[PDB]
Amino acid sequence: GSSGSSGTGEKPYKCNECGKVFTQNSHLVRHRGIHTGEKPSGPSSG
Ligand SMILES: [Zn+2]
C-alpha cells in the first residue's frame, strides 16, 4: 500500500498516450503525430 506524493509541477498541456508536456499547445499536437495512426491504444480509466 503506497501513497500519492507522485508528480511535481504538471503543465496544462500533457499527452495521455505516453505522457509528455509542452510549453505550447501547437507543439503538443505535433508530438501526437507519433501516436496518430500508430498502435493507438487508449487507456481504460480516465
Ligand atoms: Zn505522447
List, as ranges, residues with CB under 5 A of the ion ligand 1: 15, 17-18
The experimental method behind these coordinates is NMR
Cα(36) to centroid(ligand 1), Å: 9
What is the chain's length?
A: 46
Task: Give yes or no for a contact between 13 and 21, defined as CB atoms under 8 angstroms apart.
Answer: yes
The number of distinct structural domains making up the chain is 1
Beta-carbon contacts of 15 under 8 Å, excluding residues fewer than 6 positions away, are: 21, 28, 31, 32, 35
The three cell numbers of residue 9 are 509541477
Residue 8: give the domain boundaries: 1-46
Cα(16) to centroid(ligand 1), Å: 6
Cα(9) to centroid(ligand 1), Å: 18
**3-state class percentages of the chain: helix first, strand second, coil last, to nearest 5:** 15, 5, 80
According to DSSP, residue 34 is labeled: T
- Report the C-alpha gap between 8 and 43 in whole angstroms: 22
